[PDB]
Design goal:
Distance between the termini: 50 Å
Number of helices: 12
CATH topology: D-Maltodextrin-Binding Protein, domain 2
Radius of gyration: 19 Å
Number of strands: 10
Strand content: 15-25%
Structural class: alpha/beta
Number of domains: 1
CATH class: Alpha Beta
CATH superfamily: Bacterial extracellular solute-binding protein, family 7
Largest sheet: 8 strands, mixed
C-alpha cells in the first residue's frame, strides 16, 4: 500500500531542527519511491514538546520530536545532557562520534527503548544563551532576580535557582506570550530558535552563556516501528542518519545568520570573559550533586569522556 507516518514537533519554520525533518521527509520518499510518506506537523501544529511526545508514546502519533530537556518528562536519564557545562562547543565532533558510532549512543537507544520509543534522529539543536527583554545582562550576578522561562527539565529549574533566578516552566508554544505580557523577564535558548520564532521582537540583551546543551530527539512509537516491514524500518533509520549529517552541516550557518539578525535588530550580545564564564560554571556546578541519584554515573562518564 502507501504508508503515511505523522511526525509532530515544536520547532519554527527555517530552524535547523525543522529543516532536518524536511530532509528526513524527502529522503524517506526517495528511498521508498513514494510508498512511505512523512507528514510534518512542525511549529507546534499539534502542541508543544510534551503533549506531542506523549502522543507518540501512546501511539496516537507515529513520531514526535522533543528537545532533550523536555524529554525529562519521560525519563530522568536524558538529564545527563542538561547538566550545566557538562559539554561545550569546542568538543562537539567527539560528542557526535560517541552518539553515532559508540557506547554513548547505545545507552541513549536503550533509554528510549525502556520508555517505548525508537530513536530515529538525535538532531542537533544547540547551546542555550540567556536573553532578557528589559534588564541589561553582562555577568553572572546580573542574572539574579530575573524571572526566567525554563523547559520542563528539573536541571534547568535547578540551574536557574542556583543563579538566583526565579524559574518558570512554560511550554514552548506559550513562551512568546509570557515574554510579551511580562510574566517572565527572559529565557535561555539558541539564537536561531529565538529569531526563527520571532522572540527577537521583544528581546534586548543576551550573554553567550552556553549553560545548557540540547538535542532534538526524533522518536517513533516503538510498537508502530516494530509493526513495519524490515525494509521500511531500514529506510527510516537510514534516512534518519543521512538527514542528521545534513542537519548538523547547516546548523552553524543558520546560527551565524541568527546572531547577525540579533545584531541588526539592536540586541546587545555580551561575550563573557574566561573568568566570568568560570564563575557561571562553578555557580551551577552544585546542581550536579543534586541529581546524582537520578542520572546513572556511567552515563555521566560517557558524556564527560567526549570532552577530554
Amino acid at each position: 500500500k502507501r504508508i503515511n507516518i505523522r511526525l509532530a514537533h515544536p520547532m519554527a519554520p527555517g530552524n535547523n531542527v525543522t529543516v532536518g525533518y524536511e530532509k528526513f521527509k524527502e529522503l524517506v520518499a526517495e528511498k521508498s519511491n513514494g510508498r512511505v510518506r512523512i507528514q510534518l506537523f512542525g511549529n507546534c501544529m499539534l502542541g508543544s514538546d510534551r503533549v506531542t511526545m506523549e502522543a507518540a508514546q501512546r501511539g496516537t502519533l507515529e513520531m514526535a520530536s522533543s528537545s532533550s530537556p523536555n524529554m525529562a518528562n519521560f525519563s530522568k536519564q536524558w538529564m545527563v545532557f542538561d547538566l550545566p557545562y557538562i559539554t561545550s562547543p569546542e568538543h562537539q565532533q567527539k560528542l557526535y562520534k560517541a552518539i553515532d558510532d559508540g557506547e554513548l549512543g547505545k545507552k541513549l537507544d536503550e533509554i528510549a527503548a525502556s520508555i517505548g520509543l525508537k530513536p530515529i534522529m538525535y538532531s542537533e539543536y544547540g547551546y542555550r544563551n540567556f536573553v532578557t527583554t528589559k534588564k541589561p545582562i553582562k555577568t553572572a550576578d546580573d542574572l539574579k532576580n530575573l524571572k526566567v522561562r525554563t523547559t520542563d527539565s528539573p536541571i534547568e529549574v535547578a540551574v536557574a535557582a542556583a543563579l538566583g533566578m526565579a524559574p518558570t516552566p512554560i511550554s514552548w508554544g506559550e513562551t512568546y506570550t509570557a515574554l510579551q505580557q511580562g510574566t517572565v523577564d527572559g529565557e535561555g535558548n539558541t539564537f536561531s530558535l529565538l529569531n526563527d520564532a520571532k522572540h527577537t521582537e521583544v528581546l534586548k540583551y543576551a550573554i553567550d552563556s552556553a549553560h545548557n546543551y540540547s538535542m532534538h530527539l526524533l522518536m517513533m512509537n516503538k510498537a508502530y516501528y516494530d509493526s513495519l516491514p524490515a525494509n521500511v524500518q531500514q529506510i527510516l533509520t537510514e534516512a534518519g542518519r543521512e538527514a542528521l549529517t545534513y542537519q548538523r552541516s547547516i546548523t552553524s550557518e543558520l546560527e551565524k545568520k541568527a546572531e547577525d539578525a540579533f545584531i541588526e535588530q539592536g540586541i546587545t550580545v555580551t561575550r563573557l570573559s574566561p573568568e566570568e564564564r568560570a564563575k557561571l560554571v562553578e555557580r551551577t556546578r552544585p546542581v550536579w550533586d543534586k541529581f546524582k541519584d537520578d542520572i546513572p554515573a556511567e552515563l555521566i562518564k560517557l558524556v564527560q569522556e567526549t570532552q577530554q
